[PDB]
Design a protein around this ligand. Structure first.
Ligand SMILES: Cc1nc2ccc(NC(=O)CCNC(=O)CCCc3ccc(CC(C(=O)O)C(=O)O)cc3)cc2s1
Ligand SMILES: Cc1nc2ccc(NC(=O)CCNC(=O)CCCc3ccc(CC(C(=O)O)C(=O)O)cc3)cc2s1
Ligand SMILES: Cc1nc2ccc(NC(=O)CCNC(=O)CCCc3ccc(CC(C(=O)O)C(=O)O)cc3)cc2s1
Ligand SMILES: Cc1nc2ccc(NC(=O)CCNC(=O)CCCc3ccc(CC(C(=O)O)C(=O)O)cc3)cc2s1
Lengths: 329, 329, 331, 329
């Protein structure tokens, strides 16, 4: 007999139970992959792309690391049959912006890619949650929704989770407190029109605006408004410095994956439909704080905004709705 | 008063306890960084390189994900003062081989680079453990030892930890067993002359050489010798496919870092001086299984080797000493 | 509207079935050590506890619930009714009598068989596709009993077996050699009890056979008395019971170890109780510990460990002992 | 040669680097121990008690599970020399209250115990942080402080970290949100006079009191005041039901240990001196939100309280001072 058979007696004779697929093995895709692998979120990871050498190479490189992981199956392919029965499918494919390019300028390029990807994802994993990372993520989350046919709870855009993480990091550097204990939301577009929620910023429940009423105004002698400018400009400052971003967005997406896979019902600011709220009457998607778990977005927190904060959100919605008029599928 | 002072009353005006430094922010050094950040091994991470924009960009990308990590200080710098008081300094700087180029051919380019790097690391963290990853890692570990002036125990080459992981991966695929439960050691050079210890290969304490005497010979109908050949050619196969390797060596390095930082006294196959063993009489460094903890390599396991397995290790020693003795520093 | 409705707009008021649910039956020290271990290893999205003493139970559930801020397992439930265990992937049975200082595990048979006659059919009614992980003693025999009562195929009925004995062996090996038990390999097989068999021929660090370096290893003439290491494995539960009254932490971690391989489908190799009819000359439905490959379908394969003639002799003895007691069963 | 010498060649034959001592091996001590071992916060764990057989037995039980942990050294003893060079020493020793007995009634018994324990801890780890868990914790932190001669940043009482955790769990049940995303602080005494800071209660930065002004009053149709009553009654109801409490406090204390050992500078409600705040003029210790890291309590968050919230806290302060002022040691 073979060595395998001399050594091993087989009793039997199985479908993956916590499978994650990542589409796109660019830097963002592979940061998402590694982060998820190291947080033990998946019993199977699947990677898909269109460049076959790059794809196989990536798969093999993670495979070689299996001894150090707790994810026992890693697969890849151009064919989406390798994505079958995923619980979560993370879409990181597409064009990405140059220095001085708006994320909104990526829309026709990435919409066209999504018309191929999304029906194939849906084909093999019709009960998955779809986490859109590709940009402009707010429009692409709407597009993925209309393409997939999924109910809106299962279509989630990474949105402002990373913007809020950035905001909280900067808030932490200013206050001398870990970002975990710093609270504050950047909502709306993941992009130039994002809205800092000054009214909700706090440490230990203590409202920062309550202690410092100029917070968020141009008069402000500490210039806190510049912390939001830095959040808006981060992706560009980093692209200018290393040519792309990868690690933070990967971590931000693993953070969201963790809340979905383990059904935590944590609150995250993610892209979803906000028609009906804040005076918006159109099918705009943008980020508001949502309750994330095993059915995706089960609930929305209806954050209370000052009139200035609400006017900015509405302007973000109007901007996104304008670009949404360009959509053909 | 400022918002900080209104909010926070300070008791203490007053150095990191568990600091790690990664030198080199190429794919390998950033995979080392992310893996370490996600295993919570450090209370501070320092990054160093010569390219200032890329360095800053990398640091910032990591920093923006701090909400999702438990490492409160991330710093970078061309200047090695950012690395002061590190427990562990991981060197990933250097030239990397092209397709069809042996790692051995990188020796003088990377020795040159080490003549700058090593005294600067040593300057600012004289009590650190030096984990060498740059290639040829066996000879470079020897070079790191001579330049630094550290005792043997605090200069550790990543060595064949990765090769053995690859081996165990390929063993697991054949056997339908997780690599954690597959045992087998690849020793000597991290390179073309690496020695597979067929005599040690087992699952659950069962000697596969005893079950299958053809194991590790070219006549073997199952062709187990090809498993080692796939280990030798792994890096080149992945380089051919994706241009470089990163994730497996990252994970392998965070595996070593874990044992050093937590003083685990686990056994890894890593590059150390083997003078005195198997009839090697010069200051040759290569991989044997070593006990790793907070003082680095505290002990070597004297692996018992068939006369051929020993002949192959003496051959790897010779190749290395050949290159090693023609170096000036 | 209410505060909840002012703050929160709901998309779904519609629950899924549990996806990664684990039940633990029995909330004694062992049961709760399993529970806390599982909770801090993030193996479950839902933990159900069952026992027959209602105040003890509610209080344990509440104590865990109070730590939820520090855990990542969102749903923790309890009840005497087995309807709280519905749709479990893995049901861990820790229920029953435990041995006094000086009492054999084999003396718990009749008491715990009767208990299982109530427990097992209840568990099967609400989770007919779960894996059963028997921890209660004598674990080899109670795994057989769980198997016969449940009607499950034998891949889904796993005894905690000698996973802990082997973990103790490795720890002691580690103290003698100066090496982490992770890097010490050695297998104790057969009964989780006095007739367990230390496999000297497979003991190794780094694939270096200790038996090969030290030919007397595991013999009485052994000047280093390695045989005493197995004796300490055998006596461990007893020295611990003698000192603190019971054991909990080590068995809790051992079970969590097994749960991890099952829930994440690792196909790692563990010495657990399973049926070994057809191996080593055993021809009856004996259950005992051999190295098994553990994954999402329970035990998918068995490693056929090669044993010296003495080591096989002792295992066949261990098997005969347990087959003996298996004759004590009436259903 | 022995088997160990044939197998292992020793290079090198050091102090404890990340050592935690737990004093008291009752249910709370051991729940602290297991929690810390499973979070990898220590490279050495020491246990201390007076009942020598229980102590030995608990050590052994932990030791036998070593294969499944990453904490390589576990030691115990009646003699405090096993605790030497601890970074963090956690005091869980003492009498505990009966069902229907106030933690304040434990004071004399546990003060007398501390007179033996505290100088013994200080002798062998003069630079440690002291985390007092024994009850009444606020008073015993003050006592530890006076006995030890430590600066006040290095003497931390577990205080209301558990109370706030219970609060957040209960809050989370009512709202359908994970406690991580529910925020609200219980301050003052760890016991009957604790103060719920209704003004700081929020999800996603949204003030619950702004939305629902009867929050925290007896009129309240939704009876939110009962959430606090349940926090206060928690240890009593758990004691009644299972006879003691262990798991929630163990986790809470590891949460604290985590912030100290990893130098995270998160904010926790923990016992410290608050003389000079909220019009308290005595050396009262009680819980307020403090920044926790490697020097213990570096900073205090000066929470903004309603006049009633402040009234309640001054009332908490008075109750404890009424006991503190009587003590002599
Ligand atoms: C028919 C077809 N099927 C496929 C299948 C696969 C692929 N594969 C690729 O396209 C791989 C290459 N593409 C990328 O990696 C795009 C990454 C986008 C990105 C970059 C940065 C950030 C975060 C960042 C910011 O938001 O700007 C910040 O804020 O930091 C977010 C998102 C192509 C096709 S075509
Ligand atoms: C004076 C100076 N100071 C500095 C300071 C920093 C830098 N920085 C850099 O040099 C960054 C760029 N260089 C790299 O990243 C080299 C990576 C080497 C590598 C690649 C792959 C593998 C694993 C692999 C295999 O072994 O081949 C397998 O087997 O998978 C191992 C090692 C330059 C200088 S110059
Ligand atoms: C109809 C009914 N339904 C129920 C439902 C629940 C309960 N609940 C309880 O019975 C709770 C109390 N029972 C225990 O906790 C027994 C634990 C057994 C144990 C002890 C130690 C070790 C490890 C040890 C060794 O193996 O000896 C070593 O080696 O360290 C393993 C196993 C009763 C009933 S009655
Ligand atoms: C000279 C001497 N040296 C020593 C050395 C060791 C020992 N050893 C013991 O005394 C061990 C037994 N003691 C305990 O375990 C006391 C636990 C205290 C406790 C219980 C519950 C909660 C949380 C709880 C609540 O606050 O009520 C809630 O809110 O849940 C907090 C604290 C005695 C002596 S005498």
């Amino acid at each position: 007999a073979t060595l395998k058979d001399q050594l091993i007696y087989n009793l039997l004779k199985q479908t993956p139970q916590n499978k994650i697929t990542v589409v796109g093995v660019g830097a963002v895709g592979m940061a998402c992959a590694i982060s998820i692998l190291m947080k033990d979120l998946a019993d199977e990871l699947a990677l898909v792309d269109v460049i076959e050498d790059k794809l196989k190479g990536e798969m093999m490189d993670l495979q070689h690391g299996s001894l150090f992981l707790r994810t026992p199956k890693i697969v890849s392919g151009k064919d989406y049959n390798v994505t079958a029965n995923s619980k979560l499918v993370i879409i990181t494919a597409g064009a990405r912006q140059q220095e001085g390019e708006s994320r909104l300028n990526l829309v026709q390029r990435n919409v066209n890619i999504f018309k191929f990807i999304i029906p194939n994802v849906v084909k093999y994993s019709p009960n998955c949650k779809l986490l859109i990372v590709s940009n402009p993520v707010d429009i692409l989350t709407y597009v993925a929704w209309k393409i997939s046919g999924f109910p809106k709870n299962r279509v989630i855009g990474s949105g402002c989770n990373l913007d809020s993480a950035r905001f909280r990091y900067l808030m932490g550097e200013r206050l001398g407190v870990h970002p975990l204990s710093c609270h504050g939301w950047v909502l709306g577009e993941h992009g130039d029109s994002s809205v800092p929620v000054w009214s909700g910023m706090n440490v230990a429940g203590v409202s920062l605006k309550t202690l410092h009423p100029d917070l968020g105004t141009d008069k402000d002698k500490e210039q806190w408004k510049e912390v939001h400018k830095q959040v808006v400009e981060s992706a560009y400052e980093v692209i200018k410095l290393k040519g792309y971003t990868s690690w933070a967005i990967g971590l931000s997406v693993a953070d969201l994956a963790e809340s979905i896979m383990k059904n935590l019902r944590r609150v995250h600011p993610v892209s979803t439909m906000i028609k009906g709220l804040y005076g918006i009457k159109d099918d705009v998607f943008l980020s508001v704080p949502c309750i994330l778990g095993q059915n995706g977005i089960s609930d929305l927190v209806k954050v209370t905004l000052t009139s200035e904060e609400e006017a900015r959100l509405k302007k973000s919605a109007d901007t996104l709705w304008g670009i949404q008029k360009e959509l053909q599928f």
